[PDB]
Each structure stands twice: as structure tokens, then as C-alpha cells.
Amino acid sequence: VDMGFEAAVAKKVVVPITFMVPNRPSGLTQSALLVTGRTFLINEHTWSNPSWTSFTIRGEVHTRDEPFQTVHFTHHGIPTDLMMVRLGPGNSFPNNLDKFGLDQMPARNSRVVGVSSSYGNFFFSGNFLGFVDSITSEQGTYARLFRYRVTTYKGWAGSALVCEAGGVRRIIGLHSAGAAGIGAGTYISKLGLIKALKHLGEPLATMQ
């Protein structure tokens, strides 16, 4: 199996993130996706949880009261589990926009590869089960996901989901949830990322 693209995702995109809390003996660790500059992707259910007082990413500590610029993605007025967060000034992330987005839909039963830094680095995989308008979760309804047949675990949220369409493999999701042997990831589109990055002021050149 060619895994060159997934290896590049592990090398440049997926990183661990740990949220520190005052009501548990240990931090909550999962994965995050570096997009470009000072902007990354993270699950909304993790970001919005009220307990954490700081988090660490890329060797940096950030407190909850910092003036983060954020976008919470919605679909037809229903919340998704996807947040984009732009940090204050600091050392830049790689520009990983070449690794996100597919213009065609993945075929039924094609291979999904998850790329995680949640428990050290690892891959997981399962068959693509299709897009769903929403999932019903212990925290409410979330919109615009796709599913895959593989048992997933607490902490695996934020892992990059690499799918295949039109002879190319790209990241089109971030892991969100699990239910009885089936995982669900929140969909990522290139157009949505670009629109949100512009809203947050992450400076980029436009190819003309």
C-alpha cells in the first residue's frame, strides 16, 4: 500500500494537543491539524468544553483568556464539530493547504486512513461508508460528517482522515465520534478553509 501521502500528513499536519484542566489529575490529549501560518483545526466539542484553563501545542502554552480568532463551521444552520483557531504571533506552521480537499466524492467502500498523534503517532483505517447529514451524539446533533467502519477510541478526535477520489488521496476530515464499531469524521472542504482563513486574516497569496 502506498503510504507516502499519509506519511507526509503525519510529518507536517497532525500534531498532539493537550488541554490542561483544574478538575482532573491529567491533561486531555488528542490531535490537531496544522493548516498554515498560525491557524489549526480542532474539534468544537473539545474547544468549547468549559473546563480547560490552558492548552499546549507545538511546544507552546496558551491560556483560555487569550484573544483567539476562531471560526465555528456550520451547515444549513446546524453546528459542525469543526473549529478553526488562529493563534497570536509566533513560529509559523507549514503551509499544508496542498494536502486538504477532494473535488470528487470517495467511492463506496474505499479506504479511509486516519493519521493520529493522540497516543504517540499511529495510523488507523477502515472502509468508507458514505456521507451523513448529521450524527446524533451524547452532546447533541452535529452536522456534515462521513463514516468509516473501524472501532475508534476516546482521544482519537482530531486525527486527519485521508480518503481517495479521482486518483488522488487528500485529507477531507477530522475524526469526531465513535458508535458501536463505526467512526464518524467531520468533513473538510478546501473552499471552506480558504473562506475561513480570509475571515481570520491569515495572509495568503492568491494564485492568478
Author numbering: 4 to 211
From the paper:
Seneca virus A (SVA) is an emerging novel picornavirus that has recently been identified as the causative agent of many cases of porcine vesicular diseases in multiple countries. The full-length SVA genome is approximately 7.3 kb in length and contains a single open reading frame (ORF) encoding a single polyprotein that undergoes proteolytic processing and cleavage by the viral 3C protease (3Cpro) into four structural proteins (VP4-VP2-VP3-VP1) and eight non-structural proteins (L-2A-2B-2C-3A-3B-3C-3D). SVA 3Cpro is composed of two topologically equivalent antiparallel six-stranded β-barrel domains (A1-F1 and A2-F2). Three closely positioned residues (His48, Asp84 and Cys160) within the proteolytic active site of SVA 3Cpro comprise the canonical catalytic triad.
